[PDB]
């Protein structure tokens, strides 16, 4: 209440209607600290790769966005070596109407279609824009190495 109240509600929604390329839930009591699992989208170099995410809800949730980062190493222009995700709805474009389930969907489609003009790893961004074959080749190999 209000944060805890909503977190519980969002958990129970994922007891009936779990996201199709996602899977969430708390690490343990605490409830403000979750861990999620997304699958690599088809036709993307991340296909056939399970990626792990850490999720920390702020105390004034849902008026502030959850802190979400990849635990699994991933090769991507909007995800750095630390797991930090460059996505507007996790920042200034956050809305209290958004749920964790929708955040995961955003992240999922970011994997399918990166935003190189919004780089967090400027070197991967460059490769993505001047040499896709290289980008795809490498990301696919990182997926083999680090994704379950």
């Amino acid at each position: 209440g209000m944060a805890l109240k909503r977190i519980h509600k969002e958990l129970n929604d994922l007891a009936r209607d779990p996201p199709a390329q996602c899977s969430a839930g708390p690490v343990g009591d605490d409830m403000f600290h979750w861990q999620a699992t997304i699958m690599g989208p088809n036709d993307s170099p991340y296909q056939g790769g399970v990626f792990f995410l850490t999720i920390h809800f702020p105390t004034d949730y849902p008026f502030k966005p959850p802190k979400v980062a990849f635990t699994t190493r991933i090769y991507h222009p909007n995800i750095n070596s630390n797991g930090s995700i460059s996505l507007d709805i996790l920042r200034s474009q956050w809305s209290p109407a958004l749920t964790i389930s929708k955040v995961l969907l955003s992240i999922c489609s970011l994997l399918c279609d990166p935003n190189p003009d919004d780089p967090l790893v400027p070197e991967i961004a460059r490769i993505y824009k001047t040499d896709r074959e290289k980008y795809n080749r490498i990301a696919r190999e990182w997926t083999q190495k680090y994704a379950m």
Binding site: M2, K5, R16, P96
Partner: protein, 183 residues
Amino acid sequence: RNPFDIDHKSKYLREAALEANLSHPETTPTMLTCPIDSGFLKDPVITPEGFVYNKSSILKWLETKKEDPQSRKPLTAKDLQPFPELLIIVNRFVETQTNYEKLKNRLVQNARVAARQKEYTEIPDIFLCPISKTLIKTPVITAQGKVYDQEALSNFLIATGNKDETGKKLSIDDVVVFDELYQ
């Protein structure tokens, strides 16, 4: 009055009533809940676009941004119209939930009475499945309060295409597990 102008209140109410009537009592219907605080709409206000929030919740958000949390279009406190009518549908539903909770308690308690009888020549009906006529192995409960066997029904719904006696459209997600009947 201009037809191109939309009255969202009468529209929202109409759709909320339907959703409530179609909603399983264990499930809290979406447009009876505040998009922001996830709880029952208790002091509902409505925006010019037609979105409904608890007053305290939407105002708390408006301290951060002056836009609607669902449309991202401009929104301020003076655009928030009182929508007390919706509470009639909310109370109508919590009544359903309460009644539904009475139904489970009644089933449980005489299932406790039935269980302490010895030497019955007939198994008590509280323990028998209506479409299997055998002992309910895995207890499972409808929204109206009838108890089936989770797979005696699952195979039955599959057989006749999510229908049952009484001829009514039922799905196995319209049904909640109910171990408490034997507990």
